[PDB]
Design a protein around this ligand. Structure first.
Ligand SMILES: [Zn+2]
Ligand SMILES: [Zn+2]
Ligand SMILES: [Zn+2]
Ligand SMILES: [Zn+2]
Lengths: 52, 53
């Protein structure tokens, strides 16, 4: 059940990015820098980025 | 002079993530979700994420 790392909510799930490497998520509107849309391809959360 | 996308400042450059797709940047402390350190390998800014398929 995906939830936003920033605000901790799982609401508005059409706007939740799901990490490609783990179960974590983020609303595009909670992300900084700002994101205007859900991107295609792969998005990695900061925990996954910290492992690469 | 790289500037942060969030706060628009170019200070504390040791804390500035640099995009591998363009010349944009972001302080780790301005990033959300939390970024405690500059990662190794690659980081893409939101403008570049929007070009992916
Ligand atoms: Zn959120
Ligand atoms: Zn992840
Ligand atoms: Zn900044
Ligand atoms: Zn970029």
């Amino acid at each position: 059940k995906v939830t936003c790392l920033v605000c901790r909510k799982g609401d508005n799930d059409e706007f939740l990015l799901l990490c490609d490497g783990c179960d974590r998520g983020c609303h595009i509107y909670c992300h900084r820098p700002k994101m205007e849309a859900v991107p295609e391809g792969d998005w990695f959360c900061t925990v996954c980025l910290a492992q690469q």
